[PDB]
């Protein structure tokens, strides 16, 4: 770390973006079933394994 | 980066095509041990060197300043 | 203040001393000091003609 | 049980030689036209330490007979040879220390080093610090020449085997007690991973023919047969006698 391949930078980038809460307007959709974001990740409870 | 002393050689720089800007600086200093005197530095920005010419003589200073090319962009102080 | 009373020689008796005499000041430093002095007094006394080269070259090795 | 130590050596894992610092291979000149019809002059340019070797090497440079340039060879230095010396290699060359000559052209009693087993193998016999070989005969028909190797064995080779007059330098190296473990240590550190040596008798049976027992002991003759098989041959392999050697050796 602290001097990364672009490969790794990329992945970390993608990761940041998946780290939002459920966009609440999905909740309103007909037949919506997704309550919250069940795949949320947090830097000190689960490590990325790269 | 460069110092200069031939008051002739200097003048020749000041008309050296790429010499657009130049600058004259003034310093209070002291003479020998007793009193002070007005020192002036003649800086010319060549394309890769800043030549400066220290005229320690207030007299030769003034006469040198009207020697300056009328087309040069002299910065005063 | 203290540091003054040192170059006045105070606070320096046997009870104020924990490094061995040699730690406090090496023997060899003493020597090099002393030898270098004799060595060069000889040179001036030679340069000056006060002493002649034959006497100087014995005093040297004798130093 | 386990694969014993002397069987793991063959795969050369941790067991290869420690090579990084060695000067290069020590070899005589390629037996070309100059050396087998006349002689050719060189200059030892340097005599120098080879890591993990007893005896110093001698960098000796020659002229290329075929191109304008200097081709440098690495010799094992004979005692006496020196920086600046001129070295002569060839059939028709002269008999002084340092030169290299086919065993044919040296009278018996001549004493030479780095000798070839066949002509041109660029040097094979007596290279170790101290060692040499003495010519003891000639048989001009089928030009063979007989010599006594360092071991004691006598052998015969082509009279076109090249040798170099003199003994190998740095002799006597083995008279100085190593004194401590660390010197053997630094010794083998530039050779190979063969030191220290656990005795097989201090091992467990999986480890060795010698392992185990409530006291330490070989428990069977330690003279193993030639016909024995890997994993069996530790001890006195094919020993034709055994015990303290009494009275002068020296082959007859």
């Amino acid at each position: 770390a602290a001097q990364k391949s672009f490969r790794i930078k990329q992945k970390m980038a993608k990761a940041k973006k998946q780290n939002r809460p459920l966009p609440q307007w999905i909740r309103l959709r007909t037949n919506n079933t997704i309550r919250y974001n069940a795949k949320r990740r947090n830097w000190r409870r689960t490590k990325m394994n790269i | 980066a460069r110092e200069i002393t031939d008051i002739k050689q200097f003048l020749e720089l000041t008309r050296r095509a790429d010499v657009k800007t130049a600058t004259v600086k003034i310093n209070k200093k002291l003479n020998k041990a007793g009193k002070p005197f007005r020192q002036t530095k003649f800086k010319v920005r060549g394309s890769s060197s800043l030549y400066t010419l220290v005229i320690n003589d207030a007299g030769k200073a003034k006469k040198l300043i009207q020697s300056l090319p009328p087309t040069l962009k002299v910065n005063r102080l | 203040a203290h540091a003054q009373s040192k170059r006045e020689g105070r606070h320096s008796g046997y009870g104020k001393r924990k490094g061995t005499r040699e730690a406090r000041l090496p023997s060899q430093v003493v020597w090099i000091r002393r030898l270098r002095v004799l060595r060069r007094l000889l040179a001036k006394y030679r340069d000056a003609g006060k002493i002649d080269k034959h006497l100087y070259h014995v005093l040297y090795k004798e130093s | 049980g386990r694969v014993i130590r002397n069987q793991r050596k063959g795969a050369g894992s941790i067991f290869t030689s420690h090579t990084r610092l060695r000067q290069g291979a020590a070899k005589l000149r390629t037996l070309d036209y100059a050396e087998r019809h006349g002689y050719i002059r060189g200059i030892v340019k340097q005599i120098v330490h080879d890591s993990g070797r007893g005896a110093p090497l001698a960098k000796v440079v020659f002229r290329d007979p075929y191109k304008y340039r200097l081709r440098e060879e690495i010799f094992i230095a004979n005692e006496g040879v020196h920086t600046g010396q001129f070295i002569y290699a060839g059939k028709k060359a002269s008999l002084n220390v340092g030169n290299v000559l086919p065993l044919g052209s040296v009278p018996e009693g001549t004493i030479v080093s780095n000798v070839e087993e066949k002509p041109g193998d660029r040097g094979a016999l007596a290279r170790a610090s101290g060692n040499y070989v003495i010519i003891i005969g000639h048989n001009p028909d089928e030009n063979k020449t007989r010599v006594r190797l360092p071991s004691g064995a006598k052998k015969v080779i082509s009279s076109d085997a090249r040798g170099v007059i003199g003994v190998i330098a740095g002799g006597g190296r083995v008279d100085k007690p190593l004194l401590k473990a660390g010197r053997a240590f630094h010794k083998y550190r530039l050779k190979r991973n063969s030191w220290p040596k656990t005795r097989g008798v201090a091992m467990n049976p999986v480890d060795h023919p010698h392992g185990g027992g409530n006291h330490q002991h070989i428990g069977k003759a330690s003279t193993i047969s030639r016909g024995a098989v890997s994993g069996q041959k530790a001890g006195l392999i094919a020993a034709r006698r055994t015990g303290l050697l009494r009275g002068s050796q020296k082959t007859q």
Binding site: - | - | - | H49, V97, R173
Partner: protein, 91 residues
């Protein structure tokens, strides 16, 4: 002021290894370190430089020699033998 009755340089090893090995070492040490005569420029300035390498302070020649002494008994006798056998070839 005679500093040691017998160990000399071998004094460094203290009590270790046992007199005899120490005596054997002392001998070869004294040879190996000692300053030698240079056959070439005639000054005593040949000191050792890793076993069998003997090279001259002033004048800068290097000679392959014995592991702890310049010339080795063997070397020399061989040098004499080679003398003699060579002579046979011109006369």
């Amino acid at each position: 002021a005679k500093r040691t009755k017998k160990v000399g340089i071998t004094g460094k090893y203290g009590v270790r290894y046992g007199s005899s090995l120490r005596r054997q070492v002392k001998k070869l040490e004294i040879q190996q370190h000692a300053r030698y005569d240079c056959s070439f420029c005639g000054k005593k300035t040949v000191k050792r430089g890793a076993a069998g390498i003997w090279t001259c302070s002033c004048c800068k020649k290097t000679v392959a020699g014995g592991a702890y002494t310049v010339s080795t008994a063997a070397a020399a006798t061989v040098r004499s033998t080679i003398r003699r056998l060579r002579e046979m070839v011109e006369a």
